Structure formats: structure tokens, C-alpha cells
């Protein structure tokens, strides 16, 4: 659902931002996050769910 993603991805994107070390780790989280936003406004829910799965992975890796 589009709302359910916005809250989930926002949290996810926070905890990735907080854990990221150099600016090269921050750049990737900031873009993924904005892309998950850009895609939800374009109503690409099936796509945003995957960019959220990429953000969700970057979060597995950072722990």
C-alpha cells in the first residue's frame, strides 16, 4: 500500500542514514530514500517496494 511504504521506508532510510560512515555511505542512502519517495508520487508502488528492498538490504549490510 502506498502509505505503508512511506512510513516503512522513512524509518528504514533513517536507520541507514544514522549507521553510515563516510560520505559515500551517506550518498547512497540519501538517493535510495529520495528515489523511494519520487517513485511513490509517480504511483510506482510495485517499483518503490523494490527500491525499499534495496534500502532494506543496505541496512542488513550496515549491521
Amino acid at each position: 500500500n502506498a502509505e505503508e511504504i512511506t512510513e516503512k521506508a522513512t524509518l528504514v532510510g533513517i536507520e541507514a542514514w544514522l549507521l553510515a560512515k563516510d560520505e559515500e555511505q551517506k550518498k547512497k542512502v540519501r538517493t535510495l530514500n529520495r528515489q523511494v519517495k519520487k517513485l511513490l508520487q509517480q504511483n510506482d508502488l510495485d517499483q518503490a517496494k523494490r527500491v525499499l528492498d534495496q534500502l532494506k538490504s543496505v541496512l542488513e549490510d550496515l549491521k
Binding site: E3, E7, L11, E15, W17, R30, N33, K37
Partner: protein, 125 residues
């Protein structure tokens, strides 16, 4: 008034958990707000914490600072509308204060306890 002195306890706690910042608690904050608000409240909440936002606490405070909330006075307007006025405070693990501000939280709610926040507007003083 047996109900309003209760509605005031729920109203303090909501403004505390919502306007606090402890980075080790964000998932419970979110969970708390999720279960105490309507979906536009809960969403504007999230659209404020997102790192897309320049003014987000996560961007400003990160892992160094920790925001605290002191409840000053509640203005009970009616049974579904209240105005909590409060003080913020940002200090690091050293104690050096950075932010100290005065805020009004203009709330609309419903309570039987089932407490739900239907509206939330902030104002700086």
C-alpha cells in the same frame, strides 16, 4: 473532568514521546505514534523525520544530541481540542546545551482508554 484529568495525562505523554529524540528509540517512537494517531497524523510525523527533510532531528542531531521535553501548561479548549505548551532541549553526552525552545502543540484528539490524536500543529514561541 474525571475524564478530562485523564485526557490530560494521555495528552502529556503524547507530546513527550512525539517531540522527544532518542536515536536508540525511534522504532518504538514510530510504533507509539502509529498506535496513537490517525494516518495523516502518523504520516506527517514520518514526512518530518525522513532524511529528505533538512529540519529533521535525524539530520541535525544524528547520534550526538538527545532532545528532552518539559510540559509547561495545557490549554483545554474543548473535549476534542487542547493546546500543550512545552520546552525543548538539545544536549550532547557532555551536557553542552545547543537547542532550547518554547513550543505550542495545538492538538485535536478523541478519548473514551483508546486515545487517538486526530490533528497536530506546532508553533514556535
Amino acid at each position: 473532568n474525571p475524564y478530562i484529568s485523564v485526557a490530560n495525562i494521555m495528552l502529556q505523554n503524547y507530546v513527550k514521546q512525539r517531540e522527544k529524540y532518542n536515536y536508540d528509540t525511534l522504532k518504538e517512537q514510530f510504533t507509539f505514534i502509529k498506535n496513537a494517531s490517525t494516518s495523516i497524523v502518523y504520516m506527517q510525523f514520518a514526512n518530518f523525520m525522513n532524511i529528505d527533510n533538512s529540519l529533521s532531528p535525524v539530520i541535525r542531531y544524528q547520534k550526538l544530541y538527545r532532545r528532552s521535553i518539559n510540559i509547561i501548561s495545557i490549554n483545554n479548549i474543548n473535549n476534542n481540542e487542547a493546546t500543550v505548551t512545552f520546552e525543548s532541549l538539545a544536549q550532547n553526552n557532555t551536557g553542552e546545551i545547543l537547542e532550547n525552545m518554547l513550543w505550542e502543540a495545538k492538538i485535536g484528539f478523541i478519548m473514551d482508554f483508546h486515545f487517538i490524536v486526530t490533528s497536530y500543529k506546532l508553533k514556535l514561541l
